[PDB]
Amino acid sequence: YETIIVEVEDHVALITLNRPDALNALNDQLLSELVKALEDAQNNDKVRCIVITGSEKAFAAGADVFAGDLFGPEAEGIMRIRKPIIAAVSGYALGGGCELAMMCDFIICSDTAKFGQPEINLGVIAGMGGSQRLTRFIGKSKSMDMNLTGRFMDAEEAERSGLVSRVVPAKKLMEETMTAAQKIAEKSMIAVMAVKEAVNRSYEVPLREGLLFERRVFQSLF
Amino acid sequence: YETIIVEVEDHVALITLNRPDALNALNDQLLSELVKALEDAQNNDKVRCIVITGSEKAFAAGADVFAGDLFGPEAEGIMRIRKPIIAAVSGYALGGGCELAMMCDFIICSDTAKFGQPEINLGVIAGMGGSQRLTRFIGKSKSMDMNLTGRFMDAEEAERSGLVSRVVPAKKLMEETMTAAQKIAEKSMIAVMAVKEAVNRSYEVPLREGLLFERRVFQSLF
Amino acid sequence: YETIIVEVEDHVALITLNRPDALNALNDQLLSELVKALEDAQNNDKVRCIVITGSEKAFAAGADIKMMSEKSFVDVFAGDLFGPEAEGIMRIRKPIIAAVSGYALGGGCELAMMCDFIICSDTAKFGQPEINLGVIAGMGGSQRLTRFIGKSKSMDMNLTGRFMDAEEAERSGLVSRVVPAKKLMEETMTAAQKIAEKSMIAVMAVKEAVNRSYEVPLREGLLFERRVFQSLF
Amino acid sequence: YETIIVEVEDHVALITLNRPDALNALNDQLLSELVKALEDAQNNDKVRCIVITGSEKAFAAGAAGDLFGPEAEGIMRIRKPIIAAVSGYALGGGCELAMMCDFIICSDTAKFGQPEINLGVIAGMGGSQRLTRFIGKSKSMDMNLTGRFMDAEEAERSGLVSRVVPAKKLMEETMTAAQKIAEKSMIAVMAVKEAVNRSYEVPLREGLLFERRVFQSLF
Amino acid sequence: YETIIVEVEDHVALITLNRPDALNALNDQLLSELVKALEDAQNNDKVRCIVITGSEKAFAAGAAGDLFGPEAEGIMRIRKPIIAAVSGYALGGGCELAMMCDFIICSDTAKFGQPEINLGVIAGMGGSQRLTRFIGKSKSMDMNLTGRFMDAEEAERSGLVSRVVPAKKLMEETMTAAQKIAEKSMIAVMAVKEAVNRSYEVPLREGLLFERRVFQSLF
Amino acid sequence: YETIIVEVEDHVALITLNRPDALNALNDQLLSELVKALEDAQNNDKVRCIVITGSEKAFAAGADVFAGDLFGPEAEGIMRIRKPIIAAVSGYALGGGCELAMMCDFIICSDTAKFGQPEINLGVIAGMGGSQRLTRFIGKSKSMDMNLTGRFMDAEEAERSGLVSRVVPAKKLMEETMTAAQKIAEKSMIAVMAVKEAVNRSYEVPLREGLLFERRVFQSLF
């Protein structure tokens, strides 16, 4: 790989974005390699949890069209992974970088994390879920504000609003995340995949139907 | 009843879970008696609000299958109650106990409350809404984390994330809760049932349709 | 206008509710003028962002009881009480910021939630006390509150009528920003000017895409968003 | 039961509405006893398929407390399959009961309709919902607004019923279908019914996922 | 009006599209006048049912600013019922207008289609949405992709229309239906139409709750 | 390919199922080759419309599971194709073969066509959309009947119920289908993809939202 680093240590695959010259901004090559790295991790029977991270400075600072379906296949590639993916976010996670963090299953971030959707500054909009996942996760006011004004959201507000699960000091981010990934790697792999799928039903079906789906999956784990 | 205590005063039915040796864990008998007590309260024209609580130590610490539809009819019994149900949560509300609290209309909890969904530790998953209600109420990151790692959530995080409405000191929990229940009992019973049903549409229909439902129900109160 | 004031400056239409004797309670006249003013702002190519505010004491302290009294079911159903007014606000394609100070209660809380986002002062108090009158929220208080802040707090507010202060509103996601009372309008007009600096097509597209979040499954919302993103080319 | 007859043979429960002098109009007693007999059939390990029918003249010709709520919910919660064998009139609540069943076999004399509008009310047990989803907006709007009847051949052509047979073959056709269903795996049959019913509650993409997960669990 | 004719008689408003030289094709002015006439009929306490029709030759043969949005919203907001009486061509915009009405009665000369693909665009007023939901994926996909026509017999067989009658009976059949609707409670008629239209917006379980609550309020 | 034949002529890719001794039953090899042929047709800028057909006798007469997601990847490969696919059905289209015909964008069939879902006879159910697409396309009674009893549906009933668009004599099936495919090949490729995508929204979103999506796609075709 030329834009990412992949390390497999004791059932956890760690994928580190590696474009320091561009503060880990997404591009065609990085997105292509990331999806490949994720697909290899999914097919690797030893991998039980995935972690995506960037640098202390930036998780990822930013990033015809209809026939090529720009941004479609990459989003699909990540969403198809059945194993869990934790985003470990330090510093900037902006634009596509914020959207990548929200596509992961949950976020653990450092107290320096800064989130934002500044696409409007370029005359376009979020194109990988910034108008959709942000709103569902943190509520209309904050998502509308962020998407319309481009304002940033700090780690404390991110935790307070439900964008992230845990905030820890920058020096403890990787320790917190790998401990969580290890703990997930201790669980039944079938149950882990079922949990992820059931949780993700929450944004696709009426609650009454999501309860039925959950109960049938629960019963099948017997 | 053998596993619960029921007291009706001033239009409030207080249902207390009473399995102290199991820390109020939900079993067949308790769920069966709980549903019966709720149905009696629904059919009791003197009851205007229901409260469910456990002990100071635990609200509730935890909880063939296809043909018997394990956990289906119990959940449906609780969800069909039209009168409002407040959960007064002290100490542990884990697994099925967390799920019961989330099935109530809102939660008031003490500062000692601890929530969690540790079903994954047994190779199964939440089977009474833990993957559905938790996600919809507090957002993807915290619900994914809780369901995948089994981590607990303390009272302060529960209020900050929207899982509970109010947190009060341990010694004020029942005073705070009963005063809320008595405020509800002062209101029109028809309007209270309409309120609860309208709010619950929020997780079943698109917003445009929920707005139409609310307005038609509002009009019917004339 | 009799009950509101409209001032356009730097591509921002500021609409100020002006029934101070009544703490800016909504009534038939105010709602009619408000919707007219929003439609004018929508058709005004000078306007790129809208701001609604009340007084320092009250954004809007409720809805006038006379809007509902003296009416039968046939009246309110055949007339579709509160339907046209809500639809008139929701159809506006330009963004609307609510600058909330003091009381935003009942219909006034619902108005703030129909806006695209809220900036409030640290004196703001929100609530849905309709249940105190034997009725319920009729302009989205049972729907938007629940979806934005979660079931527990919405159920509690709609059933008990309890208030929510500015700090809890921000912590629960009801509002985007809380500032001191002295900076409320400066914070809000600066955000509105920032929005007015952007492409008007992209701004309307952002607002429409965000609002899909409450109408379609996420998978379909993602498809809609990507097709609109692509159409901006 | 005073108003219904229940007969169990070859793992099929035949439930006959027994108010023929009222053309099997659904009153409080019939509806209560119908739900009770359905619940008994569900809890009866010998029953694997259910059939509901009325008389040759009428399947069922018309009809805080949540009026009509509990009855509809009681029918909808039955997990075993229910076939409606419809002869003659199926009107109002009777048409709605037929549509609540999993599918309809009807005789060529069957007549469907929703004439609730004639009384100043509307369908209150699914006539505005199931009819529209099953046969399309034009015919459902027309039936609900004008009260017009739909005959057996139009019912099959529009998808309201699955099969039309001569009046003298109705029970033979239906009991043969029901007996065949009752020979199948009970778990798979309940799974089939549940998956099919997802079609009206979830987006197709999600219904596909549900169906595939249920299919897999049958392993 | 310059593009339409409006006649009110015996509680029925008849709106006739009148662009003979364009075979009643929809344009800015016609849609503007149609919405205005519909809104006047909504506000006219004398009108209880609306009918839209064109000529014997054509119902309607075709068609930042949100092109085609506000007019569609204006038609969809009408609470009183609207019957489309379709003779001859109902194509493109004209097929979409007919589907936006509450139900269709058509002559045996009616011809439906969505030929927008021929111009390098697509249906823009519901032809990809209502057609599919009313008649099924296969025929809607075929019609929208190939531009093929659908005759009156196929329209009734597939559920696109409620009734097909001879050309000379179209207006009599339609005005009789409109008169029957005008005999009913206006509150119940508005409720019925709104309940039926829930069928395409909510899960069935929720549509049933909505219907039951509106039914109960009609007391 | 070993189980299918693929021929591109005049912007139409004809894919013929070719397991005649098995009456074109779907197996792992055929589904793998079919998906490959579809993806190649999608990436082939000369292809504007796809046709799938079998033999005169049968289109297709029939055909660990959770971790491998049995039948998921195959269904998803067919559904992601953006160009249109016509099913030309003669003779038997049963089980997985009926489901394959329903996954295509529309069906033209001969008067000898026979459809059915006999999975229930094996103790399983439809696992590739037979419980979902059949019901949505032709109504609850006929779908419930077919799925519970395994009864066949003949060509006339298929057209009458909306399962197929057109029925023609056996000798005219391929002529009718290729002429339809040529008509589609004459159209704008971007508008053809938009039509198919807009039509398919009909089964995923509320009608009001599908109208919004349709109008925005219509506008962008400018």
Structural features, described:
Chain C: This is enoyl-CoA hydratase. Chain C: Keywords: Fatty acid metabolism, Lipid metabolism, Lyase. Chain C: InterPro entries: ClpP/crotonase-like_dom_sf (IPR029045), Enoyl-CoA_hyd/isom_CS (IPR018376), Enoyl-CoA_hydra/iso (IPR001753), Enoyl-CoA_hydra_C (IPR014748). Chain C: Could possibly oxidize fatty acids using specific components. 6 copies of one chain form a homohexamer. The first copy, chain A, has 222 residues and is α/β, with parallel strands linked by helices. Chain A has one domain: 2-enoyl-CoA Hydratase, Chain A, domain 1 (Alpha-Beta Complex), CATH 3.90.226.10. Chain A is 42% helix and 19% strand. In chain A, the strands form 2 sheets. A 6-stranded mixed beta sheet of chain A has the order 1-2-3-5-7-10, sandwiched between helices. At the B-D interface, helix 8 of B face helix 8 of D.
